[PDB]
């Protein structure tokens, strides 16, 4: 569909087993926030985001409940047709051109995720790294698979080798 702008206002995904939920908003293709279902808090993408204009998180909770309700009904109606695991792809890229001793961020773009359950780990020189990592929500695709980005903040040194490794049922 064509348009100058696109809001995604109330994207909800629910999943069993494990009762796994996710409520997000999105504008022009970027995540505004998600609601944290344990803390019942709105969590914004950038710290500049929910200051002037807020979103009350309980509305997110309701959509989660309806979707848990809908899943059950629909699961049964399909005679229990289970989800087909997909094979996700990872692609790394820098946020700005890499220079030595220069503050940078590696960005892992992971696409064709389904179902939305996945591990995205960073490895520096084959050894796992967790210091400095941020990971987005499951972001929707038109074909109803998801994508997701991890960010590894880092100090560029020569001989430093980074890679983004993905664990999914579909591999």
């Amino acid at each position: 569909i064509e348009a100058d702008h696109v809001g995604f206002y109330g994207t909800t995904v629910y999943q069993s087993p494990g009762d796994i939920g996710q409520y997000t908003h999105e504008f022009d293709g970027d995540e505004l926030f998600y609601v944290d279902l344990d803390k019942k808090k709105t969590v914004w993408r950038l710290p500049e985001f929910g200051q002037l204009i807020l979103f009350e998180p309980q509305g997110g909770l309701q959509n989660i409940a309806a979707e848990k309700h809908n899943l059950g009904i629909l699961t049964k109606r399909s005679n229990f047709t289970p989800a087909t695991n997909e094979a996700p792809q990872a692609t790394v890229f820098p946020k700005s051109p890499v220079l030595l001793g220069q503050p940078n961020t590696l960005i892992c773009f992971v696409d064709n995720i389904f179902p939305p359950v996945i591990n995205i780990t960073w490895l520096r020189n084959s050894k796992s790294v967790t210091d400095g990592v941020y990971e987005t929500s499951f972001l929707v695709n038109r074909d109803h698979s998801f994508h997701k980005l991890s960010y590894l903040t880092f100090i560029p040194s020569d001989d430093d080798i980074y890679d983004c490794k993905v664990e999914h049922w579909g591999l």
């Binding site: 696109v6 809001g7 206002y9 629910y14 069993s16 807020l54 979103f55 009904i73």
Partner: protein
């Protein structure tokens, strides 16, 4: 505040997924709004309300009875959402946030016949125009470009390359135009 679109409740090694998608399509500000909700079982969209159609419809057999239910119960309040959610979010929430967000691009020429790389990074919104010039003249042959790369943190980056003849005393310039700038950025090289 910001408002969400309602996921409407239906009637009564393995994994199962349900997905509700509520999509507001704005064209020319708020002059034309299109509201689309989608109910998806696993990867299958079975039920859809589309403001242009004006009511719920089953997309697949799986949503046959769901369409009629959602039309009896939810039809009127779903239509109204085009106004209380879509229009309300745009006009009262996006305008003073997203639609005002301006991030100026960082331009950096680098070298790698050879290849000049114009890195254009950390900008928003997406609209941008990057050109190479040699002697005030626009290069066309030997210009390669990446697709606009979305970073996921509300900036974009793009990379524009030029294969060139390194004659000493030739000056290549990367010219960049973007809504954030009151004047285009120009960055030169050898």
């Amino acid at each position: 505040s910001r408002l969400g679109l309602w996921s409407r409740m239906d009637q009564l090694e393995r994994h199962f997924v349900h997905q509700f998608k509520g999509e507001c399509y704005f064209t020319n500000g708020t002059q034309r709004i299109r509201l689309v909700t989608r109910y998806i079982y696993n990867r299958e969209e079975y039920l859809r309300f589309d403001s242009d159609v004006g009511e719920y419809r089953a997309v697949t057999e799986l949503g046959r009875h769901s369409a009629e239910y959602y039309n009896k119960q939810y039809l009127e309040r779903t239509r109204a959402e085009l106004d209380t959610a879509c229009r309300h979010n745009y006009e009262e929430t996006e305008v003073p946030t997203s639609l005002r967000r301006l991030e100026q691009p960082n331009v950096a020429i680098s070298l790698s016949h050879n290849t000049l790389v114009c890195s254009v990074t950390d900008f928003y919104p997406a609209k941008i125009k990057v050109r190479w010039f040699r002697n005030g003249q626009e290069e066309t042959v030997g210009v390669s470009s990446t697709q606009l790369i979305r970073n996921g943190d509300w900036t974009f980056q793009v990379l524009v390359m030029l294969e060139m003849t390194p004659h000493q005393g030739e000056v290549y310039t990367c010219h960049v135009e973007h809504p954030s700038l009151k004047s285009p950025i120009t960055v030169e090289w050898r």
